Scaffold this active site. Structure first.
Site, mmCIF file in Angstrom:
data_model
loop_
_atom_site.group_PDB
_atom_site.id
_atom_site.type_symbol
_atom_site.label_atom_id
_atom_site.label_comp_id
_atom_site.label_asym_id
_atom_site.label_seq_id
_atom_site.Cartn_x
_atom_site.Cartn_y
_atom_site.Cartn_z
ATOM 1 C CD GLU A 35 -8.021 -0.184 -22.037
ATOM 2 O OE1 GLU A 35 -8.814 0.172 -22.817
ATOM 3 O OE2 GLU A 35 -7.063 -0.642 -21.922
ATOM 4 C CG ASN A 46 -8.689 -0.783 -31.940
ATOM 5 O OD1 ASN A 46 -8.902 -2.195 -31.834
ATOM 6 N ND2 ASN A 46 -8.923 -0.046 -30.962
ATOM 7 C CG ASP A 48 -6.195 -2.841 -35.923
ATOM 8 O OD1 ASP A 48 -7.288 -2.536 -35.906
ATOM 9 O OD2 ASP A 48 -5.551 -3.521 -35.408
ATOM 10 C CB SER A 50 -9.511 -4.331 -34.725
ATOM 11 O OG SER A 50 -8.654 -3.911 -34.072
ATOM 12 C CG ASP A 52 -10.004 -2.063 -28.370
ATOM 13 O OD1 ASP A 52 -9.670 -2.868 -29.122
ATOM 14 O OD2 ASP A 52 -9.201 -1.313 -27.661
ATOM 15 C CG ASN A 59 -8.339 -5.517 -30.703
ATOM 16 O OD1 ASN A 59 -8.242 -6.364 -31.620
ATOM 17 N ND2 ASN A 59 -7.907 -4.296 -31.051
ATOM 18 C CG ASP A 101 -1.164 -13.218 -24.209
ATOM 19 O OD1 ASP A 101 -0.620 -12.586 -23.558
ATOM 20 O OD2 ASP A 101 -1.808 -12.825 -25.451
#
EC number: 3.2.1.17
Length: 129
Positions: A35, A46, A48, A50, A52, A59, A101
């Site tokens: 990562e 990203n 969209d 957003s 990271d 994110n 989650d």
């Protein structure tokens, strides 16, 4: 801060990530490797819009606030900048919430595509843990 492999393993272990939700330490190290290349200051935008942040590329859409991700949540209640620190405490705490989650470590695309199903314990091979 750019961590050494074994150096991050020990930090990850002291903070309780080893076998957190069943994921051996090698999974967490492998994920960080792919990562962020172990670099706490790693940032990546990203599609969209957003971004990271950190060793585990957490994110801004759901987890932290960077003030520029419309409709975002900040479920770890932190500035995304806190995820860039030499002190990995905020990244780990937040990672713990994410992995808990429902989806497990699949939340990390580089884990799913590059760690899952591999010999992840190679990533802590030779470390004094």
């Amino acid at each position: 801060k750019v961590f050494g492999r074994c150096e991050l393993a020990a930090a990850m272990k002291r903070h309780g990530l080893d076998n957190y939700r069943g994921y051996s330490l090698g999974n967490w190290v492998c994920a960080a490797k792919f990562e962020s290349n172990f670099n706490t200051q790693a940032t990546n935008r990203n599609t969209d819009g957003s971004t990271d942040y950190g060793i585990l590329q957490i994110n801004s859409r759901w987890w932290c606030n960077d003030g520029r991700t419309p409709g975002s949540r900040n479920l770890c209640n932190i500035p995304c900048s806190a995820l860039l620190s030499s002190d990995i405490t905020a990244s780990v705490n937040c990672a713990k919430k994410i992995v808990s989650d429902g989806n497990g470590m699949n939340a990390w695309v580089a884990w799913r595509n590059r760690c899952k199903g591999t010999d992840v314990q190679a990533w802590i091979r030779g470390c004094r843990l």
